[PDB]
Amino acid sequence: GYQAVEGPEVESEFFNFDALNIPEHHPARDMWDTFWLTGEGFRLEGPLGEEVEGRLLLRTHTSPMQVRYMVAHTPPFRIVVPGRVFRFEQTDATHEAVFHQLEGLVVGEGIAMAHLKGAIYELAQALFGPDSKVRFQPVYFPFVEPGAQFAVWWPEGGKWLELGGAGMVHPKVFQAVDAYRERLGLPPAYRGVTGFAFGLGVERLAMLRYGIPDIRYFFGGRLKFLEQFKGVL
Amino acid sequence: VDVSLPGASLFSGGLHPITLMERELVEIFRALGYQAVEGPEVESEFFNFDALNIPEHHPARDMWDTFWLTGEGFRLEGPLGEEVEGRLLLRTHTSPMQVRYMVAHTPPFRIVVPGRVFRFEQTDATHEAVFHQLEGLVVGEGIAMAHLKGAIYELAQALFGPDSKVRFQPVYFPFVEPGAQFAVWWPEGGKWLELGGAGMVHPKVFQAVDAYRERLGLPPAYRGVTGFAFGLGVERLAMLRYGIPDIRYFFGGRLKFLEQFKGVL
Amino acid sequence: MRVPFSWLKAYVPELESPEVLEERLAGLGFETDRIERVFPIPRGVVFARVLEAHPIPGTRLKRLVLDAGRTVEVVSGAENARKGIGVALALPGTELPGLGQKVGERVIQGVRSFGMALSPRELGVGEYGGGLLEFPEDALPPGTPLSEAWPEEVVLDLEVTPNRPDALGLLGLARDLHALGYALVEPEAALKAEALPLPFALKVEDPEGAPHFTLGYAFGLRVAPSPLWMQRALFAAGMRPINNVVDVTNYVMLERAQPMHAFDLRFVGEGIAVRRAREGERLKTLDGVERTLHPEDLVIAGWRGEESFPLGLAGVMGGAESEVREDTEAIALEVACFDPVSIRKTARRHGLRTEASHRFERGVDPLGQVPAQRRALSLLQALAGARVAEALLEAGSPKPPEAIPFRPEYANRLLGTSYPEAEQIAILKRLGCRVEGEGPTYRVTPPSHRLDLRLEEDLVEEVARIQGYETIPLALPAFFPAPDNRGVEAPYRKEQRLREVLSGLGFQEVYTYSFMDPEDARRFRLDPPRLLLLNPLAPEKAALRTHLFPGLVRVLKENLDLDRPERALLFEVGRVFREREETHLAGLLFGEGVGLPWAKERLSGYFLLKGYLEALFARLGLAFRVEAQAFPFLHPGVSGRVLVEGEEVGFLGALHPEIAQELELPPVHLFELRLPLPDKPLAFQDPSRHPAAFRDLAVVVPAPTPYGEVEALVREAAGPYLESLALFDLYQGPPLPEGHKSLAFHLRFRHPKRTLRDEEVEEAVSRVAEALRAR
Ligand SMILES: Nc1ncnc2c1ncn2[C@@H]1O[C@H](COP(=O)(O)OC[C@@H](N)Cc2ccccc2)[C@@H](O)[C@H]1O
Ligand SMILES: Nc1ncnc2c1ncn2[C@@H]1O[C@H](COP(=O)(O)OC[C@@H](N)Cc2ccccc2)[C@@H](O)[C@H]1O
Ligand SMILES: [Mg+2]
Asked: Cβ contacts of residue C686 below 8 Å, gap of 6+?
């Protein structure tokens, strides 16, 4: 019951960092090596088609969409967000600068972690299994407390795969949402509701699934490679 | 060069409206966690009537005008790839699949079953002899009618609405008690549309299932679980949706008609 | 962060093994990146003490007379080598990690060296190698194999998240293992202090930079090598032993996440002043580097009379001059809490990242200072036999944490678990929280070393990890989504059906970087990119693509160079950046075309690309057409704008040859549109059964006239019963005006309710021919 929606690749420092409990001068802002932009006359649109301000950049993860969506809608809901993201690291065979992620967000009254756990489990089963299972370890993210990193059981290859991160949406994020909503004249909608979100690396997974070895292969427009997936379905 | 000229005549394909409507109905239920599976068009009197609480010589067997078959060397396969016996016929509705599935699987589950069915009535503009239906079945412990009601409601919303709503009236079917016929609120055209039937799976059907399962050596799986099923007319709906007037139009292989749905998606 | 098993085991005695440990930590929120065995010491290496050190005349070497059990001589070049220390003696025959050549008895320079004493690098316990290991002369009975006192150790490479700065101290982690139920052993800081007054003063001129600051006083110091277990522990943690005193500041910095520095009083003068640096102040830092300060840099200085001089860089590193050495007998102990941002700024401002800087940037316990002092001091009294004053110089009183409201029921509700209240509190209390109140909502005040604990949720994440994330059940939610979420998926789906149709029509999909080489704005005749990077990955990816096709074409080339495809048809959907972010779709065709492989003919080129295009819309149910338009990047004549149903979006045409050639490339055909495509909601329409009216017709119009207006007119005048209109032929034509052309037009007509009376046919036909060239 999740619905797929997309966000913009060029974001505002506000939606990418500020909205999510991410600080300017503290260690958090320092986990994502960002690509800053410049140029004038470029119009950035807000959740409601309004112009927003902030230093421009290339969305560092898909999370910002968590906010644009929550500002524009009313819970309860389930969404999933595919998207090309950008990071400044050096390109090796398991890491790139231009990759895609898939974000997931479920908000509603009564939402609990067991639901996030269930969600992820259904994902593993659906991908490998039912002889496959899920691994949740605590980890830290500014936008979710409890935070967690999760791995999936690949019965075939016989190893654990670290897939992404997730957690229970942070109070400060809900706060930010309503605050911006009222700024726009809308009534608060996220007081007293709960929610979980997660996000995972798509290339990291496509590679394991379709048996690709070099992550760099994706953006290398070589036909001999591309055609290899002609009949994938 | 003259660029406004026509390019190389390349064939542009299309899809049949029924396939289109099927696909839409399916995508819808898929979102509620239902899975699509198919059955055979040629069935055994056992799965079409007997399995479902339908009697031989009573008024029930008399609601469906059947097409009986003959011929030898034809092999009919059972839920488990076994040969089954019974007078052959053309499935009168998709319901039989309710049984083939339950025999072959373990609850809890959600399935939806599209399928071409056959009936002996005279073909008018709202009725045919060869049409399709979509069956739905959800079995599990705790299942109640409110779930069947919810299910159907989500369907209306998904089709028209959210300014649309659902109508459930009691009706009779041998395989479900409580039985019900249901209509949907079409805010646009402003009228109620009788879509299909549904109800809570009948005890005798669960019984039949386990009984046949043990006959095949499998343990009983439907003791103490509950469930609801429903089934609806696809043409009746495709017509209302894609704005078609004559149900006979579907099986009339006219291109001028078929192509009209080229870009439906 | 290195974690020496045995060291941590000192605070958590009942530890099962490095493996169970990696386990326990992973569950607490700490991932082990690596595990290692470390101090392999052959029976060959033994403890020895230097009795005499005689230099060899005419050389830069010394002959060392060692007590190894039996006396013996070795020859060393190492500078720290001298009478009065214990050393690591690798006897002849010993096999060392480094040298594949076995240690032997070599005659060095008139003296036969019985083996060799070792540097840390040589023994394998550390990276150093610029001098011998130095041990308390009396560490062990001369001769005893070193392994006896230096067992191998296991070191976990851990990952401490920014939210757990208290975790940079082994004792910090030990407090967690304790939460899991393990017994916790806090070092007892035994101290015999004296009443005397402190021989210096403290002035904190920039309290914003140094919120909490303390000074300790230790005198009567006997500085010497650190005892073995400490050298072992420090080496294990990746740090290098210097002397008992310095080693203690490092040990304690690693134990609690509290860096601290010992300053030799000889250089303090009247006292310590914590202040910003004066413009162009100089400081020769500990690393031997001479540096120039910036006025934002907080520094630890001293002053004599009216002299204020810098002693060290606040929170980051100490000065070379004031640093403790053998001849030191009294010092002042810096134990403070600096302002993270200043340290961060200052730290990255010069080329530095130190154990201390790191911890101060991440956060220090705002109240750990005084207990930290008692620890270090007690240690000092013990290893350096220091006399310690009972008083401290303190500056800035920081406020304690406040109570956090906590509802056990909420915790369960949020996780979807059912832990009994008691279990929960028990946990928080084990973590060092104070829990007041009777229920159901409690007053919970966290320990100060916990900076990550502020909200009730932070408190919940806790019960979770301690109870174990695996103990949270599995569930699935069910609810009717709020109404405004209803249609949401439409756009996304729309794009996908499209993406899908293309691959089915015959286009290979491609993914291109969103970057752009500003230079191509030239190479390809197009305006410049409105967005540029402030940190481009490369000057060739410094702009943001404004168009998609340049990239496709560019892909074309490199493919040709790698594998030589005869033909190629492909597409790509991506986000281009102009005034606003836009979703574009472009496709490129090249090659011989389609037709019989063996058989000669091909059918390709522009009209082939158009062919497909037309089919695609045919499939999408959209009425498309092209009209010649001038495009800077498109060869003219073969240039054209595209008109999806009733609209202008994108273009289509042949790649301008000038560019064709500026690139080692032959001819290419393109098109690039903007999505989403508009859509025409189908209006179904009954076709009539009455046979159509057929016609043969041709039009002669100037050679320049575009097919467009032609079809257009004929069409607009045909009348309301024109079922079909096609073009079966045309040619310039000898039999007609040098400047005109011919047009084969097949025509069809139909009337729904009845058949078309010829009266209306040859009649309407004229309706057309009339205004046809009447125009
Ligand atoms: N350089 C890179 N190249 C390719 N894949 C990368 C990558 N850096 C990270 N990834 C993948 O992308 C995923 C997300 O990046 P990461 O920075 O770990 O998480 C970032 C959040 N967007 C995930 C999250 C959402 C909601 C709640 C909690 C967490 C990772 O799990 C990883 O598999
Ligand atoms: N001759 C015909 N032509 C076209 N559509 C027809 C038709 N006869 C019936 N239908 C459509 O097909 C649907 C199913 O046929 P009907 O005989 O009414 O129900 C029969 C069951 N298969 C439905 C059901 C399933 C599970 C539980 C309860 C009821 C009807 O709702 C109707 O809309
Ligand atoms: Mg926490």
From this structure: B245, C752
Is the CB of residue C571 less than 8 Å from the CB of residue C509?
yes
What three-state secondary structure class fits C378? helix
| Phi, then psi, of C231 in degrees rounded to 5 | -60, -40
- Nearest CA owner, ligand 2 atom 33: B233
Rounded-to-integer distance, Cα C401 and Cα C459, Å: 14
Positions of A annotated as catalytic residues are: 32, 61, 87, 101, 144, 197
Planar angle of CA B54, B60, B61, nearest 5 degrees: 70
Alpha carbons C644 and C620: distance in angstroms, whole number = 11
Which ligand places an atom closest to the C-alpha of A142? 1
B150 lies within 8 A of chain A by CB: no
Distance, in Å, from the CA atom of C651 to the CA atom of C653, rounded to the nearest integer, reads 7
Both tokens of C185, joined, read 């052993």
Specify the amino acid at residue B92: T
Way the structure was solved: X-ray
C669: Cβ–Cβ under 8 A, 6 or more apart, which residues?
Answer: C588, C589, C590, C605, C606, C608, C609, C653, C654, C655
CATH number for position A93: 3.30.930.10
Amino acid at C439: G
What is the 3-state secondary structure of C506-552?
CCEECCCCCEECCCHHHHCCCCCCCCEECCCCCCCCCEECCCCHHHH
The secondary structure element, H or E, covering residue C594 is none
Q: Does C479 touch chain B (CB under 8 A)?
A: no
Beta strands in C320-473 (DSSP E): 330-337, 387-389, 393-395, 404-406, 434-436, 442-445
Sorted by sequence, the CB contacts under 8 Å of residue C598 that are 6+ apart come out as none
Classify the C-alpha dihedral C758-C762-C765-C767 as positive or negative: negative
Structural element, H or E, at residue C53: strand C45-55
Alpha helices in C29-158 (DSSP H): 120-123
C-alpha to C-alpha distance for A233 and A230, rounded to whole angstroms: 8
Residue C448's contacts (CB-CB under 8 Å, 6 or more residues apart) are C365, C366, C367, C368, C400, C401
- For chain C, domains (ranges, CATH) are 1-37+154-186 (3.30.56.10), 38-153 (2.40.50.140), 187-400 (3.50.40.10), 401-474 (3.30.56.10), 489-679 (3.30.930.10), 690-775 (3.30.70.380)
Interatomic CA distance for residues A135 and C195, integer angstroms? 58
Q: Are C416 and A112 a contacting pair, CB within 8 Å?
A: yes
Residues 1-60 of A with CB under 8 A from B: 1
Is C415:C459 a contact under the CB 8 Å cutoff? Answer: no
Q: Which single residue is written with the structure tokens 């092999």?
A: B75
Q: Residue B89 has what DSSP assignment?
A: E
B94 CA closest ligand 2 atom index:
22
Q: Strand pairing partners for C350? A: none
Q: Is residue C274 within 8 Å of C169, Cβ to Cβ?
A: no
